[PDB]
Amino acid sequence: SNVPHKSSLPEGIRPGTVLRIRGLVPPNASRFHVNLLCGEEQGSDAALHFNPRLDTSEVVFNSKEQGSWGREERGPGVPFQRGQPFEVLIIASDDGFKAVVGDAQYHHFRHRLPLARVRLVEVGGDVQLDSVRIF
Amino acid sequence: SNVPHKSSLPEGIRPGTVLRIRGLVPPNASRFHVNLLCGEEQGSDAALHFNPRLDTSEVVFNSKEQGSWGREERGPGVPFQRGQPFEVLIIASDDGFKAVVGDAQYHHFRHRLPLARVRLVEVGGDVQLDSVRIF
């Protein structure tokens, strides 16, 4: 494992930016995450932390600012399964991020940090990442 | 076998809206269309008319305002084939519609009508639809 994926967003992201993540959850995965970060330094603020937790069957959403985590939000269940492929859309809108899993909107995360600060996508944890694409 | 597919959008669509269309272009297909319409009336204004033409090997984009069509825009060649499945994203931003076809950004259509007018997605013509989803 032990390596996160990083993708720069040269144009930043605006309402209408779509991140498509395709991958599969390894059969003994505990957790993985997708972070929208505001810069390339290791403590940088996270506009969005999307963290499916399959050892506890839940999906946590949060933000991180000046080094401290915000309040956890969480969706209905976990739309991921060990050993199973997935396709996630993270869609930037004017008032938040829409997290789509499969064929259904899973959660709407209202913006906590300004959208214009987001500068990179990071994908880490127990996941087999097939493809990260920005549209 | 096939039918005009309508998705009603009573709250409209906002920037950061993804229309995902999956289907088959059947073996003898001439052309098909995805319309973002402003109402349910016959001949409603169209914010976007997306029109792959298999018979002429072009993809046409246009609008229909106040009864008459605008000037057509064309994408580069035809990324559709008779007898092949496809995935199209139509992504609404503040300034236009982004068309993605099978992992490749394909064309950008600047708004000609205010996005707020859109009330209905219609998919018709020579296509065998798998799914239409609006996120």
Q: So where are chain A's domains?
A: 5-134
The answer for residues whose C-beta is within 8 angstroms of residue A107's C-beta and 6 or more apart is A59, A61, A73, A75, A98, A99
Rounded Cα gap, residues B101 and B54, in angstroms: 15
Return phi, psi of residue B103, to 5°: 75, 5
CB of A94 within 8 Å of a chain B CB? The answer is yes
Rounded Cα gap, residues B130 and B87, in angstroms: 10
Q: Name the closest residue on chain A to residue B94, using Cα atoms.
A: A15
Write the DSSP symbol of residue B115. Answer: G
CA A135 from chain centre, in angstroms, equals: 15
Q: Strands A58-65 and B32-37: what pairing?
A: unpaired
Q: Tell me which residue in B15, B103, B131 faces A15 most closely, judged by beta carbons.
A: B15
Q: Strands A46-53 and A58-65: what pairing?
A: antiparallel
Architecture of domain B5-134: Sandwich (2.60)
Residue B61 near residue B50, CB atoms below 8 Å: yes
Contact B18 A91 (CB under 8 A): yes
Rounded Cα gap, residues B15 and B31, in angstroms: 28
The answer for residues whose C-beta is within 8 angstroms of residue A115's C-beta and 6 or more apart is A12, A13, A14, A15, A47, A92
Rounded Cα gap, residues B49 and B94, in angstroms: 18
DSSP chain A: ----EEEE-TT---TT-EEEEEEE--TT--BEEEEEESSSSTT--EEEEEEEETTTTEEEEEEEETTEE---EE-SS----TT-EEEEEEEE-SSEEEEEETTEEEEEEE-SS-GGG--EEEEEES-EEEEEEE-
Q: Is B87 annotated as a binding residue?
A: no
The answer for residues whose C-beta is within 8 angstroms of residue A35's C-beta and 6 or more apart is A46, A48, A49, A50, A121, A122, A123, A124
CB of B69 within 8 Å of a chain A CB? The answer is no
Among B98, B27, B36, residue whose Cα is nearest residue A18: B98
From the number of C-beta atoms within 10 Å of its C-beta (0-12, 13-18, 19+), residue B26 rates as middle
Count of alpha carbons within 13 angstroms of residue A40, beta-carbon side = 5
**Strands (E) located in chain B:** 5-8, 17-25, 32-37, 46-53, 58-65, 68-69, 73-74, 84-92, 96-101, 104-110, 120-125, 128-134
Rounded Cα gap, residues A39 and A28, in angstroms: 31
Rounded Cα gap, residues A116 and B64, in angstroms: 34
Radius of gyration of chain B, Cα coordinates, nearest whole angstrom = 14
Contact B135 A17 (CB under 8 A): no
Write the DSSP symbol of residue B94. Answer: S
Query: Experimentally, how was this structure solved?
Result: X-ray
Among A120, A118, A119, A95, residue whose Cα is nearest residue A108: A95
* Opening angle at CA B21, ends B46 and A128, nearest 5: 140
